[PDB]
From a paper:
Although the structures of CX3CR1 in two complexes exhibit a similar conformation with the receptor Cα (residues T31 to Y305) root mean square deviation of 1.4 Å, the superposition of CX3CR1 in two states reveals obvious differences in the extracellular part of the receptor. Compared to the ligand-free complex, the N terminus of the receptor moves closer to the center axis of the helical bundle and the extracellular loop 2 (ECL2) is pushed away upon CX3CL1 binding. CX3CL1 binds to CX3CR1 in a two-site model: The globular part of CX3CL1 sits on the extracellular region of CX3CR1 and occupies chemokine recognition site 1 (CRS1), while the N terminus of CX3CL1 [pE1(pyroglutamate 1)-T6] forms a hook-like conformation and inserts into the helical bundle, CRS2. Another conserved glutamic acid, E2797.39, that was reported to play important roles in chemokine binding also forms extensive polar interactions with H2 and the main chain of G4-V5 of CX3CL1 (30, 31). The comparison of the binding modes of ECL2 and the 30s-loop shows that the CX3C motif fixes the 30s-loop of CX3CL1 closer to the ECL2 and would form a steric clash with the longer tip of the β-hairpins in the other CKRs.
However, the only member of the CX3CR subfamily, CX3CR1, recognizes its sole endogenous ligand CX3CL1 to play essential roles in the cross-talk between monocytes and endothelial cells in the periphery as well as microglia and neurons in the central nervous system. CX3CR1 primarily couples to Gi upon activation, subsequently mediating multiple signaling pathways, causing cell migration, angiogenesis, and apoptosis resistance. CX3CR1 participates in numerous physiological processes and is involved in many important human diseases, such as atherosclerosis, rheumatoid arthritis, neurodegenerative diseases, and cancer, making it an attractive therapeutic target. To reveal the molecular details of ligand recognition and receptor activation for CX3CR1, we solved two cryo-EM structures of CX3CR1-Gi1 complexes in the ligand-free and CX3CL1-bound states, respectively.
Numbering used by the authors:
A (entry chain C): 6 to 55, 182 to 233, 241 to 354
B (entry chain D): 30 to 340
C (entry chain R): 1 to 50, 55 to 66, 124 to 410
D (entry chain E): 29 to 61
Write the structure that this text describes.
């Protein structure tokens, strides 16, 4: 039975290696990117880094990150979205000035609604990024926003328009308890964006750690 | 088929039990394959590595790290020297099994697809057929690593495909309610099968090779043959509306397995089309199930990160 | 050790030395009843009143009260009932934790370890009940074995609670690096270390406990005769209730601050459930810790009054009964506050 | 023909029915269980 013992010990050793690798993988935070064709701005402006999906290894505050862009997948979203369960947070990059271009905002609304109604990401929050805010001011001086948001009932001030857009995204979050949407207006400085990402990930981790008890 | 099969004797209830429990995975499993040795099976998960399971002794023999963590399918070559896996990176990786120096290393990294790889099958020891998410199925060769033959007859996201016993015929199903056979030698579609209303996720051939069973997402299993071509046999339960993930056949084809996503698997009769057994040993969604060539044991993986073998 | 359960009927600390007189009629063996007190001397005044120079004279010529007995009889059935409910609850909790949908969970493993320590408490109690009911003992070793199990269970339970509080502190406030600091294997190793620490700390408490005729007396070699009692009392106080309070006070304060900063107080039921379990832990153990500290001061003549001594002895007995009720009430609080736990009860219903 | 195909399938099923371990009970020692 010497060969049986050799096989058993080899299997135990590789099982220990597998357990260590799995623990290491769980020690790394995973994130998912989504949008309406415009995304990856945060990765580009990160200034540093380490195919259907692109994995961009990223570490901040001694915490590893894993962003998997899926904008290159032309198949049905729901069919390859269920395999993304367990991701701490979902990064949603949408261009602010997409309302004028044509229907883009309607497509983004539909995608957000589908994401929030896929009965697969109930326990994972969604991180919202509003891109192209620097262009938004000169895009909005001319456009009254009424074309994309009929009955807006507001002034042309940037503050009110941004508040109303964030209100739109708040309304989509049918479940306001399980998922907490965090929104931040992406800016030129990468420090603020990475700080917001870190804060959102920390909040998600804190929320998850409150559901690992044996009483729930 | 029901009228013809009215006078036969149903198999009846079977007390299927978990012969052994395999708990070497910490993540869900999407697909698995049964080897010709009737003792080794392959499973894949999100841990970022592929392992080969020895059901007879309840041990793992190989531990192959995967470059693409988001592996969605795997297959085990009939010769037992090559193991293939898919993923979301649109690349099918071929790994040797102790071919040289006893260690495990990647033989080739097949590439050229755009949509996610949903299922791969080792047609022969040299040519591998893979199904991608871009509506096209490509037959690759390890020696040259290029599409020997490309099939674009489908119009939807192809999900799974199976291999005929003669290793010269395969079919795949897509989202559209239309699956048509493809011939390796002919290279063009020959038979078209319809009758579905939702997506198709499970495809496997009847061991005789003259028919195949598929499971859609509307809790319906349909049998298609090469003679009638009108879906002579249809299977339904009228109790649940959940979809079907994986479907397989017994050695003789009398007993059929269904990978229903209601936390348990349903075992039906190919001809009787009646309930035969329930496999409620899984605590999560089930997407893996296969019958060994000799039929001695049956494996079944699930999203619960555990795999169990039924005798 | 485990001072509550004893055959203590006379105690004498106020007066030890007496002049040799003919009034002596006999000398009761208070050592057998409780070797915390030495041999007492009895006078001829028809009442229970109380050295080397008197010992020779006595040979040549030749109080706790009964309230404890009545309390003990009621105390006996008390441990009987709380055994049934507490053991059933702990077994159900252990089964639920073992049959967990999500494995490799640090919190679940720690909770299971705490349940096992509570089970040690439950398993060791019946031995003391059997000792009280009959005054027989078991091979002069079951008493000591039961004392060791009592201390091991108590110290493990207190230690396991503290590390869970530390684990929650990490996982909440320092999540940036807690994931990297702790994993399933690390949690198992820390649990084994906590078990080892419980063994080490409880060893001196039960290191010298020779089962007496009807109790667990102590060898107390001449050097350690005074250190062993005071060492046991200070150890079970400082490391039992005082330091855990500070560690839990530090932790839970930080989780609350983090939740308020993150506006997660609304979703803070999970931390609250442990907090209610933690606060009741102190409330039930506080009467035991104060009394055991007071009797420690008794060595310094803190309560020389005989009536005060009886009151302290009664207080110590009842609070140990309170602790016994708490160890079975802990799963009860778990069911009251737990949500999935209630589903398990209905699942097995 | 549909009837001919069904008859052939049934004949194939019954021919190998005795050789299918799942269909009929088998000794525990015989199979790896
Ligand atoms: C409230 C008081 C009385 C409880 C005492 C706290 C002590 C016993 C706890 C706190 C943190 C624990 C340690 C945390 C880290 C590890 C590393 C692990 O690989 C072995 C055990 C070890 C070394 C633990 C042993 C016990 C420990 C030191
Ligand atoms: C070693 C010393 C310095 C530790 C002392 C820490 C003290 C300040 C901690 C321990 C427990 C904490 C309390 C625990 C519970 C709450 C309820 C919450 O809704 C408001 C704050 C409040 C009331 C905390 C305030 C601060 C607190 C009292």
């Amino acid at each position: 039975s010497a060969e049986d013992k050799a096989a058993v010990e080899r299997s135990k050793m590789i099982d220990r290696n597998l357990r260590e690798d799995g623990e290491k993988a769980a020690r790394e935070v995973k994130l998912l990117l989504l949008g309406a064709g415009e995304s990856g701005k945060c990765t580009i402006v990160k200034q540093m880094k380490i195919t259907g999906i692109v994995e961009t290894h990223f570490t901040f505050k001694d915490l590893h990150f894993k962003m998997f862009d899926v904008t290159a997948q032309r198949s049905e979203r729901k069919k390859w979205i269920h395999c993304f369960e367990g991701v701490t947070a979902i990064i949603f990059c949408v261009a602010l000035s997409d309302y004028d271009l044509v229907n883009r905002m309607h497509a983004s609304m539909k995608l957000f609604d589908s994401i929030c109604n896929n009965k697969w990401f109930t326990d994972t929050s969604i991180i919202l990024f509003l891109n192209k805010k620097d262009l938004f001011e000169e895009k909005i001086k001319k456009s009254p926003l009424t074309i994309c948001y009929p009955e807006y009932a507001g002034s042309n001030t940037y503050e009110e328009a941004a508040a109303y857009i964030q209100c739109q995204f708040e309304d989509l979050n049918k479940r306001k308890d399980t998922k907490e949407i965090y929104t931040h207006f992406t800016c030129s400085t990468d420090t603020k964006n990475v700080q917001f990402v870190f804060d959102a990930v920390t909040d998600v981790i804190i929320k998850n750690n409150l559901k690992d008890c044996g009483l729930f | 088929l029901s009228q013809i099969t009215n006078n036969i004797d149903p198999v009846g209830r079977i007390q299927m039990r978990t012969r052994r429990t395999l708990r070497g995975h910490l993540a869900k499993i999407y697909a698995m394959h049964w080897g010709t040795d009737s003792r080794l099976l392959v499973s894949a998960s999100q841990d970022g590595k592929l392992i080969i399971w020895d059901s007879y002794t309840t041990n793992k023999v190989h531990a192959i790290p995967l470059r693409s963590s988001w592996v969605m399918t795997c297959a085990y070559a009939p010769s037992g020297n090559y193991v293939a896996c898919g993923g979301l990176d649109n690349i099918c990786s071929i790994y040797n099994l102790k071919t040289r120096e006893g260690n495990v290393r990647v033989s080739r990294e097949l590439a050229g697809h755009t949509g996610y790889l949903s299922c791969c099958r080792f047609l022969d020891d040299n040519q591998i057929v893979t199904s991608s998410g871009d509506t096209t199925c490509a037959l690759w060769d390890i020696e040259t690593g290029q599409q020997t033959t490309t099939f674009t007859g489908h119009t939807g996201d192809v999900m799974s495909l199976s291999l005929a016993p003669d290793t010269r015929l395969f079919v795949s199903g897509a989202c559209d309610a239309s699956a048509k056979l493809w011939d390796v030698r002919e290279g063009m579609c020959r038979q078209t099968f319809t009758g579905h209303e939702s997506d198709i996720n499970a495809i496997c051939f009847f061991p005789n090779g003259n028919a195949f069973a598929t499971g859609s997402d509307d809790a319906t299993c349909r049998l298609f043959d090469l003679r009638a071509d009108q879906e002579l046999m249809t299977y339904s339960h009228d109790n649940i509306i959940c979809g079907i993930t994986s479907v397989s056949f017994s050695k003789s084809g009398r007993l059929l397995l269904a990978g229903y996503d209601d936390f348990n698997c349903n075992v039906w009769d190919a001809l009787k089309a009646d309930r035969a057994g329930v496999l409620a040993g899984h605590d999560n969604r089930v997407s893996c199930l296969g019958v060994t060539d000799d039929g001695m044991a049956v494996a079944t993986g699930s999203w619960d990160s555990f795999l169990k073998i039924w005798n | 050790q485990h001072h509550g359960v004893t055959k203590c009927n006379i105690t004498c600390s106020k007066m030890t030395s007496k002049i040799p007189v003919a009034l002596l009629i006999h000398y009761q063996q208070n050592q057998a009843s409780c070797c915390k007190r030495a041999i007492i001397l009895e006078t001829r005044q028809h009442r229970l009143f109380c050295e080397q120079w008197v010992k020779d004279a006595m040979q040549h010529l030749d109080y706790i009260g009964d309230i404890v007995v009545f309390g003990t009889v009621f105390l006996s059935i008390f441990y009987s009932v709380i055994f049934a409910i507490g053991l059933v609850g702990n077994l159900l909790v252990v089964f639920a934790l073992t049959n967990s949908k999500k494995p490799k969970s640090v919190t679940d493993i720690y909770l299971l370890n705490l349940a096992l320590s509570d089970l040690l408490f439950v398993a060791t109690l019946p031995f003391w009940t059997h000792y009280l009911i009959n005054e027989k003992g078991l091979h002069n070793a079951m008493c000591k074995f039961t004392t060791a199990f009592f201390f091991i269970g108590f110290f493990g339970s207190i230690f396991f609670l503290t590390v869970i509080s530390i684990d929650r502190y990490l996982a909440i406030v320092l999540a940036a690096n807690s994931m990297n600091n702790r994993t399933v294997q690390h949690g198992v190793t820390i649990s084994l270390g906590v078990w080892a620490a419980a063994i080490l700390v409880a060893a001196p408490q039960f290191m010298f406990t020779k089962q007496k005729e009807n109790e667990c007396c102590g060898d107390y070699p001449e050097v350690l005769q005074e250190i062993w009692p005071v060492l046991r009392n200070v150890e079970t106080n400082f490391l039992g209730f005082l330091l855990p309070l500070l560690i839990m006070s530090y932790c839970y304060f930080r989780i609350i601050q983090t939740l308020f900063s993150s506006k997660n107080h609304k979703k803070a039921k999970a931390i609250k459930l442990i907090l209610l379990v933690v606060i009741v832990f102190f409330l039930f153990w506080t009467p035991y810790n104060v009394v055991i500290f007071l009797e420690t001061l008794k060595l310094y003549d803190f309560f020389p009054s005989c009536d005060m001594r009886k009151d302290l002895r009664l207080a110590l007995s009842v609070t140990e009964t309170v602790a016994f009720s708490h160890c079975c009430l802990n799963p009860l609080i778990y069911a009251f506050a737990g949500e999935k736990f209630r589903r398990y009860l209905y699942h097995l219903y | 023909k549909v009837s001919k195909a069904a008859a052939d399938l049934m004949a194939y099923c019954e021919a190998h029915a005795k050789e299918d371990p799942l269909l009929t009970p088998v000794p525990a020692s015989e199979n790896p269980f």
